[PDB]
Amino acid sequence: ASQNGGSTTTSLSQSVRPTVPARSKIPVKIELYKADISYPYEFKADVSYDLTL
Amino acid sequence: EPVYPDQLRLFSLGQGVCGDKYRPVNREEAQSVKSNIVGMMGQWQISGLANGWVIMGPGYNGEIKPGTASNTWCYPTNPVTGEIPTLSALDIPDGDEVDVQWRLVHDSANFIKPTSYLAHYLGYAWVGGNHSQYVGEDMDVTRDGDGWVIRGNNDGGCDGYRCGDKTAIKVSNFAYNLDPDSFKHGDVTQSDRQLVKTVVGWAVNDSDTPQSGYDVTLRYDTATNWSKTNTYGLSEKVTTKNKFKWPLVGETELSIEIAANQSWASQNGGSTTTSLSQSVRPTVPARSKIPVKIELYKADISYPYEFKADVSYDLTLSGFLRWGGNAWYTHPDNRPNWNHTFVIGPYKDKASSIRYQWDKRYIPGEVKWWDWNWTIQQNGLSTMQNNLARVLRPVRAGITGDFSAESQFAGNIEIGAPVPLAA
Amino acid sequence: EPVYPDQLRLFSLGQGVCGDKYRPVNREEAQSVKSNIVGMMGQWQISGLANGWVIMGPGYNGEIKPGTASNTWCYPTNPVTGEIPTLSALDIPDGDEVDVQWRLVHDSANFIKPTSYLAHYLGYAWVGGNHSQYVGEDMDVTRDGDGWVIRGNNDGGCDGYRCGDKTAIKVSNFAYNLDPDSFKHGDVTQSDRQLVKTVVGWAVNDSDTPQSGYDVTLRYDTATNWSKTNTYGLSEKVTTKNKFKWPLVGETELSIEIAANQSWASQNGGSTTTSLSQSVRPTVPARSKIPVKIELYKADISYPYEFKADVSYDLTLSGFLRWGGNAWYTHPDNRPNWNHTFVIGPYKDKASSIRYQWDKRYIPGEVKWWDWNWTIQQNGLSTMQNNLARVLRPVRAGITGDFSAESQFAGNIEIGAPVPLAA
């Protein structure tokens, strides 16, 4: 038998490390979330042209 | 420079080609007219163009060709903006989520009267007796179980018919974003905690000179996997058999069989794993013995949350348009109900403000809503702008609240006293 | 600005529309009334509104329409707060976990009398003879096996019936969180230790100039995997056979068979692995020979723990409400028992304080508890506030204790003397 196949995985892997040179108790909070994002965009001059007749 | 349909109607006084004393009408803008010719032109009516050409109304197939006639050159000479008069954000009294949302849903001036009026311009049907273009005499504003606006059934009268229908406005599933520093979450509290695991360690450094740090690296990984496969198999077998049989033990029934097997399968699947992997490394420049403790735990977390001003609004209207009874042009009149998108928040293809702009420019893109321009024929589209502004403007009021979620992983690192060591 | 049901009753003296000399009643707040109209209005009774309109009691379907009548404009003119009088945290004498928890469960003023009274307002049934609105003459406070409060059965008398029922208050499965520096764990002790593994190494640096550090990196990974799959297979086979048989050896019984196989399966599964992966790297700027030792081990760990003040309280009551016998409105009267949530600790949807606030604002969200407002009709909801405060306030007392767990992995790194090397 012969076979082919493949898989794709995406990982979100954050690393947080406070140096904290202090004698203390320091809370840290790391969050993952999903969202809809939208940005207004500033004007851009150039455009490329693709033409077939 | 596209010409807006607003002023586009005929200039009565003008001659046109013979010398209007205005800026010329041209081919480029002329072609852009086809989708709203009916608004401007009568069936037989004729209209001119500066390059010695003419346009004809809907009665004809007409291409852009020679003729003589008047039109508006006047409007193109001095175009007018078309903009929303004021973008300014509304300030509503602050509070908690229940009350702030209510006040917004309650506001006659800020919410209801304008939303109803906008609905009126846009095609929504009317109910019973009227007082002005918005919320009728019999009409009322009460709350739905969902928190939406609703009214009583008994009186009826939509489009002057006894049917039960009433207009309703949805409260959105609120979503917000905040650019400023103006909000915060307070100190955390753990409602419940269970301790999952602990790991302890130390670095022993008796000798004077060699001092170096210690690294503990952990990984807690749990994962789930799911997959499904489908296999198809085809079996082909040809067999022959003879009954001669071989005397010693050929077999009385002697068969020979060949089977060809073919099978193939395809599958898909996937898995997700989450890992909590802390790394602790004390530098510890000292001659010592240093304990370190690393902990993993599970807990319920809750935070009080500081007031935040902004909120985004998502609105889609009721399905009343089908009852609407106004001149459509773009859509045929149909009985079955269709909910019409009002999106205030920025979703480019959905948002109303863009569609308003798009209608002014004229773009043939894909569309699934009733267009803005027919209002010009029906209502003139004047002095409406402030009403549209009422709906479109951002609204904000500080809502204080809570931050809570399902139980989550948490962790901790403790460091001991570096006990003096000696050789 | 939502109007609270408290003061909402009728103003007897007032005329209303004809000129009350108060701030106007309006439509926005009027619609918000529907869910508690029965409290305020008689069946036929009529009430007014400032925009020349009127409201009618439960007898009618009535929409908001024209009429003339009095109502409260008075209360809306000057609203009152509705708040809890004092949030202050209670201080109880310190001790160990057994005793501190007991003292809390024992406190008549701080726990029992107020909790019982709150229960009384909220719908809990009464038992036998009474002394005040809380814990009756016959009633008593003793401890359940679980540590909860309980009383003797013999006397009986719930709702004045011989049945055995008694009120009980649960001790929570305590959970706490601490913002301050005020707590600590002491030195660790190893009850037992087993040594899992050891690895040793060294860097030899004879030559004068090249001096560089050495890195030992380890990984100990153990994992478990679990999965289950289900496969469905369908087999379709058509066969034909002839009996002509071929003389040499066709086969007397000549069959040809074709089988089509189809199968598919889906599965899910997952695995978790934990790794202990230490990394040690001495910089060792010296011309030397340096031994390093890295150890993995398993052990039982125990720490004495310094006193911590705060504790969070989780409370759900008994199931007595069904026996309760008070005017319900929201719920029908039913015999089967239902436990009612009291959550003191912050869980937004569960917590009592929020529900109290929510009832004041009026929000139609999903709800599964008896509402706060019916108390106004039944008891007036006055001078109760301090009692609610008694239950709601945070309580703290230092409890010293132990920190213990199941045996865990631990590790260690030892560094040797850097022995002088020469070329």
Curated annotation (Swiss-Prot), chain A:
Residues spanning the membrane: none
Superkingdom, natural source: Bacteria
PTM field: Proteolytic cleavage and subsequent release of the propeptide trigger a major conformation change, leading to the formation of a heptameric pre-pore that then inserts into the host membrane.
Compartments it resides in: Secreted; Host cell membrane
Family designation: Belongs to the aerolysin family.
Quaternary structure note: Homodimer in solution; homoheptamer in the host membrane. After binding to GPI-anchored proteins in target membranes and proteolytic removal of the C-terminal propeptide, the protein assembles into a heptameric pre-pore complex. A further conformation change leads to insertion into the host membrane.
Free-text note regarding domains: The C-terminal propeptide is required for normal protein folding and secretion; it maintains the aerolysin precursor in its soluble form and prevents premature heptamerization and pore formation.
General function of this protein: Secreted, cytolytic toxin that forms pores in host membranes after proteolytic removal of a C-terminal propeptide, leading to destruction of the membrane permeability barrier and host cell death. The pores are formed by transmembrane beta-strands and are approximately 3 nm in diameter.
Protein's recorded name: Aerolysin
Taxonomic lineage from the root: Bacteria, Pseudomonadati, Pseudomonadota, Gammaproteobacteria, Aeromonadales
Gene it is expressed from: aerA
Full-length numbering of the shown residues: 289 to 341 of 493
